């Protein structure tokens, strides 16, 4: 895997060269499908290596959900230095994998035939995507995971082909997805930034480090936050707010070039607060009108090989819409709220208008890129500030 854009051009993509995506060296000045929709689709599942079988995971079965939780907890994405691993919770996985329109065959597992052990996964969920001047029904691909003992055995290309086949069967021919690695061909490159909330714990676990000309006492004072948010009328989102949150979001996202197009049911699903999964706060002004909202989702990570600190509680910026409160004030209150809720760090990407507040609110740039990709869609690349899509 290549993490850098120039080091990826020294690479050969035996699998991705067979796929309908632009070549990494290609420069795109067209808008449309790489290849036409297929009007006949392979009916049989692709072949897995001997001893492994497909299994669609019913995540409404608590035991199966727990098997997925364990597969990801032990084998999903780690940082560069193998010190931290994502720790998606079971109830978070239910939120991310059963939005409106979810399909059981799109929760695509791989099991050992003998032991029944879950050793592979990939998922699709449906999403209407606005890309420049086109609105397309697509899927979002997420949670591609291969057990560590199954790695480097061409199992991931099979998972990609098999979910592609199952999506094609439902009449969808484009997808969107993100990754930390460079593949053919990013439609946009974003960067994670981090805002320390408990700088002490973060330095002790070597998530962060003390700056050269700074001390620990200075570091704690630098990152100190108000006890309570300052925006008048800020409160948790309630059911009565679902229409206005939908309206605010739809209007706000028109300015970007890669965005979701959410129904009101999708807005309920993605924003209605659920403890330890998703937080949404609206601004209800002195007239009783909701004029802004902030949101962030809960995604802890496992701290590997540490005798005392086992987990890092992280908040991830989701969608933040401002029409009367300045964005800078909204995000300051998000940090205060995340601090109040026990989070250790607040992460945000440099997409949408986030660059207007990252430096001012004392975020530090991260070392990991997040590349955005479209499958079977040719369009010009865009800068981070035009990406208006956040995936879990």
């Amino acid at each position: 895997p290549a993490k850098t854009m120039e080091e990826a051009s020294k690479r050969s993509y035996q699998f991705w060269d067979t796929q309908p995506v632009p070549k990494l060296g290609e420069v795109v000045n067209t808008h449309g499908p790489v290849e036409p929709d297929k009007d006949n689709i392979r009916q049989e599942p692709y072949t897995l290596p001997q001893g492994f079988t497909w299994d669609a995971l019913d995540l409404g079965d608590r035991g199966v959900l727990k098997e997925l939780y364990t597969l990801l907890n032990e084998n999903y994405v780690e940082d560069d230095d193998n010190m931290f691993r994502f720790d998606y919770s079971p109830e978070f996985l239910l939120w991310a994998l059963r939005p409106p329109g979810w399909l059981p065959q799109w929760h695509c597992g791989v099991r050992v035939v003998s032991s029944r052990k879950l050793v592979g996964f990939i998922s699709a969920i449906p999403a209407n995507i606005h890309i420049y001047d086109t609105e397309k029904k697509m899927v979002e691909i997420n949670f591609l995971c291969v057990h560590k003992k199954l790695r480097s055995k061409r199992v991931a290309p099979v998972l990609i082909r098999e979910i592609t086949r199952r999506v094609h069967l439902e009449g969808i021919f484009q997808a969107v997805y993100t990754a930390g690695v460079v593949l053919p061909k990013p439609v946009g490159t974003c960067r994670y930034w981090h805002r320390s909330l408990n700088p002490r714990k973060l330095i002790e676990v070597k998530f962060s480090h003390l700056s050269r000309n700074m001390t620990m006492q200075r570091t704690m004072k630098l990152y100190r936050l108000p006890e309570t948010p300052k925006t008048a009328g800020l409160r948790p989102m309630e059911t009565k707010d679902i229409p206005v949150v939908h309206q605010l979001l739809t209007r706000y996202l028109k300015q970007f070039h890669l965005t979701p197009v959410m129904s009101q049911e999708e807005v309920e699903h993605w924003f209605y607060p659920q403890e330890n999964i998703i937080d949404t706060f609206v601004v209800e002004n002195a007239n009783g009108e909701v004029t802004d909202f902030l949101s962030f989702y809960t995604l802890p990570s496992t701290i590997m090989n540490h005798p005392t600190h086992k987990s890092l509680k992280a908040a991830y910026s989701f969608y933040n819409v401002h029409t009367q409160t300045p964005l800078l004030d909204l995000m300051s209150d998000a940090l205060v709220l995340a601090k109040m809720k026990g989070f250790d760090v607040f992460n945000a990407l440099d997409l949408m208008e986030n660059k207007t507040f990252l430096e001012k609110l004392k975020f530090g740039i991260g070392d990991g890129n997040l590349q955005y990709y479209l499958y079977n869609w040719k369009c010009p690349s865009m800068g981070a500030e035009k990406v208006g899509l956040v995936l879990q």
Binding site: N142, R191, Y192, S208, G364, D367, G368
Partner: peptide, 7 residues
Amino acid sequence: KSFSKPR
């Protein structure tokens, strides 16, 4: 999806 540390 991509695990980032402060650079």
